[PDB]
Structure 1
Amino acid sequence: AMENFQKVEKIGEGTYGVVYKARNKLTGEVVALKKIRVPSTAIREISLLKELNHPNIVKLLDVIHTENKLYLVFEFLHQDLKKFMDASALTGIPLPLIKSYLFQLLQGLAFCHSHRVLHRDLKPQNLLINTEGAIKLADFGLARAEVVTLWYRAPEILLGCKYYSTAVDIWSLGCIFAEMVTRRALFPGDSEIDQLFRIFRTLGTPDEVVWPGVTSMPDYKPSFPKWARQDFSKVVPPLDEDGRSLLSQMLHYDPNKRISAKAALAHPFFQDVTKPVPHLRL
Structure 2
Amino acid sequence: QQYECVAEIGEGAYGKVFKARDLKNGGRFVALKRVRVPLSTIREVAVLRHLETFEHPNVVRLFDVCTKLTLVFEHVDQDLTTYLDKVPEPGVPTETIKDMMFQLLRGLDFLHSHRVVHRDLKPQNILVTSSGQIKLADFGLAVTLWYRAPEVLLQSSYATPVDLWSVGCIFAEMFRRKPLFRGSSDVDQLGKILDVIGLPGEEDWPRDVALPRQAFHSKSAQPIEKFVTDIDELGKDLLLKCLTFNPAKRISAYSALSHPYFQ
Same fold (TM over 0.5): yes
Query: Match of 1:92, SS?
Result: coil
Query: Distance between the aligned counterparts of 1:205 and 1:138, measured in 2?
Result: 33
Q: Give 1:59 shift.
A: 1.1
1:176-200 per-residue CA deviation (whole Å, 9 max, x = no partner) reads 1101112221101111111011001
Does the 8 Å contact 1:64/1:70 carry over to 2?
yes
Q: Which moved more, 1:190-199 or 1:200-209?
A: 200-209
Which residue number corresponds to residue 99 of structure 1? 98
Does the 8 Å contact 2:125/2:138 carry over to 1?
yes
Does the 8 Å contact 1:4/1:26 carry over to 2?
yes
Query: Distance between the aligned counterparts of 1:248 and 1:138, measured in 2?
Result: 25
Aligned partner of 1:199: which letter?
Answer: I
Which residue number corresponds to residue 275 of structure 1? none
Which residue number corresponds to residue 66 of structure 2? 64
**Equivalent of residue 24 in structure 2, options 23, 26, 33:** 26
Q: Runs of 5+ in structure 2 lacking a partner?
A: none
Q: Give 1:216 shift.
A: 1.8
**Equivalent of residue 152 in structure 1, options 144, 147, 153:** 147
Q: Runs of 5+ in structure 1 lacking a partner?
A: 272-282
1:47-105 per-residue CA deviation (whole Å, 9 max, x = no partner) reads 2211213110011221212xxx1111111000100000111264211111111110011
Q: Which has the higher contact order (CA 8 A, sep 6+)?
A: 1
1:102-126 per-residue CA deviation (whole Å, 9 max, x = no partner) reads 0011011111111111111001010
Q: Give 1:226 shift.
A: 2.0
Does the 8 Å contact 2:35/2:70 carry over to 1?
yes
Query: Distance between the aligned counterparts of 1:89 and 1:156, measured in 2?
Result: 35
Q: What does 1:235-274 align with in structure 2 at a 5 Å threshold?
A: 235-271=227-263
Report the TM-score, using the length of structure 2 for normalisation: 0.93
**Equivalent of residue 205 in structure 1, options 172, 194, 199:** 199
Aligned partner of 2:40: which letter?
Answer: T
Q: 1:74 to 1:42 in 2, by over 3 A?
A: same
Q: What does 1:1-282 align with in structure 2 at a 5 Å threshold?
A: 3-28=1-26, 29-53=28-52, 54-65=56-67, 69-88=68-87, 90-143=89-142, 148-161=143-156, 163-208=157-202, 211=204, 214=205, 216-227=207-218, 228-271=220-263
Q: Give 1:127 shift.
A: 0.4
Identity over aligned residues, as a percent?
52
Count of matched residue positions in the alignment of Structure 1 and Structure 2: 258
Query: Distance between the aligned counterparts of 2:14 and 2:60, measured in 1?
Result: 19
Q: Give 1:137 shift.
A: 0.7
Does the 8 Å contact 2:196/2:221 carry over to 1?
yes
Give me the CA root mean square deviation. 1.5
Report the TM-score, using the length of structure 1 for normalisation: 0.87
Does the 8 Å contact 1:31/1:76 carry over to 2?
yes
Q: Which 4+ stretches in 1 moved above 3 angstroms? A: none
Aligned partner of 2:144: which letter?
Answer: T
Aligned partner of 1:135: which letter?
Answer: I
Query: Distance between the aligned counterparts of 2:13 and 2:155, measured in 1?
Result: 21
Query: Distance between the aligned counterparts of 1:86 and 1:223, measured in 2?
Result: 39
Q: 1:7 to 1:217 in 2, by over 3 A?
A: same
Query: Distance between the aligned counterparts of 2:178 and 2:121, measured in 1?
Result: 17
